[PDB]
Amino acid sequence: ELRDQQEQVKEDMETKCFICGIGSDYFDTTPHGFETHTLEEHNLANYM
Amino acid sequence: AESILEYFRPYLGRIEIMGASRRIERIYFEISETNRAQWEMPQVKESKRQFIFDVVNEGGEAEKMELFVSFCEDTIFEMQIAAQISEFWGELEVQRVKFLNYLSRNFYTLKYLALFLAFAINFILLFYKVSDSPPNMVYYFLEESTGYMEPALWCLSLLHTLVAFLIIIGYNCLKVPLVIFKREKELARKLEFDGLYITEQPDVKGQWDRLVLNTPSFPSNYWDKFVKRKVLDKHGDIFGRERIAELLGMTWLMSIDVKYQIWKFGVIFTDNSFLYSGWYMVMSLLGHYNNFFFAAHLLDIAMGVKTLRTILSSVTHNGKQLVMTVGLLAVVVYLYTVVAFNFFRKFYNKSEDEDEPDMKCDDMMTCYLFHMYVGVRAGGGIGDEIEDPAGDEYELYRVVFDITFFFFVIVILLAIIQGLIIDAFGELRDQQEQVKEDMETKCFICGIGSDYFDTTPHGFETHTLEEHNLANYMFFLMYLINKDETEHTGQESYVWKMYQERCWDFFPAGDCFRKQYEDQL
Amino acid sequence: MVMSLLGHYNNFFFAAHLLDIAMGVKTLRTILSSVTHNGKQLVMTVGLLAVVVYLYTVVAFNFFRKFYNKSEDEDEPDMKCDDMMTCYLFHMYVGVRAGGGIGDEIEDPAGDEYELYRVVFDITFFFFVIVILLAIIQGLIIDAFG
Ligand SMILES: Nc1ncnc2c1ncn2[C@@H]1O[C@H](COP(=O)(O)OP(=O)(O)OP(=O)(O)O)[C@@H](O)[C@H]1O
Ligand SMILES: Nc1ncnc2c1ncn2[C@@H]1O[C@H](COP(=O)(O)OP(=O)(O)OP(=O)(O)O)[C@@H](O)[C@H]1O
Ligand SMILES: Cn1c(=O)c2c(ncn2C)n(C)c1=O
Ligand SMILES: [Ca+2]
Ligand SMILES: [Zn+2]
Numbered sequence: 001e002l003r004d005q006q007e008q009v010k011e012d013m014e015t016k017c018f019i020c021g022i023g024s025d026y027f028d029t030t031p032h033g034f035e036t037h038t039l040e041e042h043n044l045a046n047y048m
Numbered sequence: 049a050e051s052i053l054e055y056f057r058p059y060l061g062r063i064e065i066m067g068a069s070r071r072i073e074r075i076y077f078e079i080s081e082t083n084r085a086q087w088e089m090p091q092v093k094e095s096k097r098q099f100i101f102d103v104v105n106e107g108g109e110a111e112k113m114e115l116f117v118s119f120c121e122d123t124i125f126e127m128q129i130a131a132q133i134s135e136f137w138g139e140l141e142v143q144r145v146k147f148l149n150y151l152s153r154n155f156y157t158l159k160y161l162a163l164f165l166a167f168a169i170n171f172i173l174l175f176y177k178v179s180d181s182p183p184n185m186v187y188y189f190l191e192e193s194t195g196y197m198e199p200a201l202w203c204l205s206l207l208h209t210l211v212a213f214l215i216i217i218g219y220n221c222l223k224v225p226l227v228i229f230k231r232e233k234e235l236a237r238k239l240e241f242d243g244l245y246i247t248e249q250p251d252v253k254g255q256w257d258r259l260v261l262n263t264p265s266f267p268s269n270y271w272d273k274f275v276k277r278k279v280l281d282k283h284g285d286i287f288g289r290e291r292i293a294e295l296l297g298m299t300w301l302m303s304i305d306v307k308y309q310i311w312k313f314g315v316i317f318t319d320n321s322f323l324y325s326g327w328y329m330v331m332s333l334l335g336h337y338n339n340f341f342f343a344a345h346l347l348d349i350a351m352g353v354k355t356l357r358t359i360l361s362s363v364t365h366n367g368k369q370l371v372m373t374v375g376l377l378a379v380v381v382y383l384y385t386v387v388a389f390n391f392f393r394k395f396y397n398k399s400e401d402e403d404e405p406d407m408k409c410d411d412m413m414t415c416y417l418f419h420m421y422v423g424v425r426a427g428g429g430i431g432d433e434i435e436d437p438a439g440d441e442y443e444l445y446r447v448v449f450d451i452t453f454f455f456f457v458i459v460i461l462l463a464i465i466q467g468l469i470i471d472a473f474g475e476l477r478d479q480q481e482q483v484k485e486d487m488e489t490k491c492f493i494c495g496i497g498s499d500y501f502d503t504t505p506h507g508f509e510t511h512t513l514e515e516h517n518l519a520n521y522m523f524f525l526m527y528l529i530n531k532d533e534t535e536h537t538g539q540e541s542y543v544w545k546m547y548q549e550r551c552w553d554f555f556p557a558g559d560c561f562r563k564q565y566e567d568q569l
Numbered sequence: 570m571v572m573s574l575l576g577h578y579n580n581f582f583f584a585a586h587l588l589d590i591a592m593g594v595k596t597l598r599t600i601l602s603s604v605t606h607n608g609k610q611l612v613m614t615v616g617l618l619a620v621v622v623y624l625y626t627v628v629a630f631n632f633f634r635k636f637y638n639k640s641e642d643e644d645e646p647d648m649k650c651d652d653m654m655t656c657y658l659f660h661m662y663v664g665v666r667a668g669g670g671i672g673d674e675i676e677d678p679a680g681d682e683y684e685l686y687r688v689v690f691d692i693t694f695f696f697f698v699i700v701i702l703l704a705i706i707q708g709l710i711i712d713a714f715g
């Protein structure tokens with residue numbers, strides 16, 4: 001179980017977020033909704 | 049028009065595309081009588097599933113159908129090689145053609161026949177005996193009745209090693225001509241869409257491939273023969289249009305390419321499925337020398353039925369953690385040694401007789417060897433092969449040296465190591481489970497799952513045998529191939545030109561006709 | 570029934586009827602149903618633990634025959650491994666039931682001439698055929714039940 005945890009993080013990132021709320025059932029409609037909406041808009045490194 | 053509809057049920061394709069001012073659409077196109085035939089057949093269907101398994105595993109949702117059409121460029125290859133085999137010195141040709149051709153059709157049963165020979169050379173060999181006086185050391189056979197078996201082992205060893213030498217012949221004519229296709233058209237892409245050898249630099253498999261570009265036969269079997277003239281233009285004007293044309297170089301034996309043979313052996317000798325089928329042979333020669341070496345061939349039962357492979361595959365894949373643990377159980381057995389070597393040397397006496405004391409622990413290169421050979425195999429800790437501390441002078445201290453062994457190095461650690469493995473096995477196979485699903489509920493061309501075509505009856509078996517059928521897009525890709533190019537119709541071009549530029553946007557990506565026509569239908 | 574006739578003949582055959590406790594209460598049926606349903610993998614494993622015990626035999630039969638001596642008295646040497654139809658039988662009857670690998674019913678290689686080589690013939694048994702394999706086979710079953 002310690003290691004499955006290391007697994008759930010690995011996800012949580014992929015599907016959802018970590019600045020806004022939403023997951024990926026919204027930027028799934030357009031192509032490449034992930035790599036736009038997390039290297040263009042809500043990029044968790046710009047805010048440093 | 050009932051009968052003509054039902055006569056042309058299996059020949060009418062149907063494919064949904066996207067484009068031409070941002071909408072969806074329906075394309076209708078003719079299926080031949082032979083692409084429907086040689087896709088229903090098992091050597092190929094196989095691959096299908098295969099692709100299906102892994103790309104649901106390590107694909108995201110982005111790079112998926114960069115892999116699809118990377119795959120449909122293959123099955124339309126060996127499909128073109130399946131027909132390559134289907135049914136004085138010149139007659140050498142017809143034999144040479146006929147022999148290997150009708151051979152390699154036979155192939156898979158030609159191997160399975162190999163196995164069953166190994167289940168006789170072992171059983172028949174499971175009768176030996178040795179003795180002081182022959183019929184020094186002498187080895188004969190037992191076979192007390194049936195005194196013709198001992199001959200049979202001579203015609204069941206010159207009939208095996210032959211059947212090894214076939215499979216090496218069969219392989220090199222049926223399967224390698226893909227595994228240089230799937231290299232060459234992995235290079236030419238990475239020499240004409242971001243120019244590996246010409247504006248960046250090399251992964252050894254990169255470096256090994258410099259040996260070929262000079263050669264005059266680089267596209268040997270990958271369709272093309274122009275890529276060369278295609279990259280004396282794209283990345284060729286900025287660089288020296290005399291400089292690059294250097295880099296590329298712009299009966300049989302009288303004109304055999306001296307180079308590019310040495311390359312072609314490059315990638316085969318590194319391909320595992322070939323490099324096994326040598327070992328499987330070269331033992332089978334060594335048999336004749338010692339004759340038990342035909343026991344080794346018995347190990348093929350791991351590379352056999354599905355579960356058995358997983359057995360060994362399991363044992364490996366978690367090897368990151370596993371070896372790095374056993375690299376710790378070999379350490380925390382050291383520490384006890386240093387403790388034992390300093391204080392409790394008096395007890396490690398295996399001498400059953402007091403005239404010749406034995407004293408297993410003096411040289412620490414032994415007392416470390418004694419612990420890791422009878423102190424982790426006794427299931428009762430180390431205090432099972434020692435005198436006991438009933439008497440005195442350390443008893444208490446000694447009885448905590450032991451029962452801290454037992455706990456650490458026989459209850460925690462040996463539990464871990466069975467553990468890793470067994471549960472790893474369990475998990476490879478649950479994966480095989482999640483694929484099984486992912487298909488059923490959702491998709492694999494569009495996005496949506498089945499919470500949309502659940503409302504209507506049979507939403508699955510319509511929307512995956514009528515609209516988004518993941519097999520039509522290989523019939524299109526090879527129906528497109530051969531229409532004479534000046535009559536590609538109104539959609540059938542804009543795909544075909546969106547294809548030789550690799551834009552993968554003629555794939556619905558979350559829509560169906562029943563998707564914007566919800567209100568009109 | 571037809572057991573229950575045979576009873577009259579030998580009269581212990583009414584012990585067989587006692588097996589109905591598997592086709593009874595729910596959990597007990599699952600017990601046996603479990604044991605079967607995964608039989609695809611299971612038999613095809615035990616069909617491998619009977620093999621990788623062979624390989625050791627061939628190794629033992631060629632080099633280490635000197636140790637397999639169960640003769641408690643030196644007047645009648647016994648030598649369990651001469652005929653490989655025995656040394657393969659000796660391994661799979663007291664070398665997977667001793668819980669300590671095969672080097673538990675043998676002389677030990679303290680003395681010489683192969684000691685190092687011998688102490689890796691054993692501790693590769695212990696690991697493979699008593700830590701991996703016998704773990705697998707309890708495993709399949711118990712979790713299948715689950
Ligand atoms: N909502 C998000 N916000 C910020 N980043 C995200 C979000 N979702 C996914 N990501 C990014 O997907 C990235 C993949 O990892 P990335 O390549 O960028 O560097 P990394 O995490 O340190 O791993 P690596 O070093 O191997 O590259 C994550 O680092 C993470 O930054
Ligand atoms: N989105 C989808 N696209 C394409 N096919 C799908 C989709 N969802 C389900 N399927 C199909 O459900 C099918 C069931 O398997 P199918 O009978 O057609 O051949 P198979 O997969 O090779 O198995 P089998 O040989 O036993 O028949 C899958 O092959 C798969 O093609
Ligand atoms: C795109 N494409 C192919 O991918 C292909 C081909 N012949 C074989 N290959 C594989 N042709 C003629 C083609 O236009
Ligand atoms: Ca036209
Ligand atoms: Zn966000």
Ligand SMILES: [Zn+2]
Pocket residue numbers: 491492493494495496511516
């Ligand atoms: Zn779909």
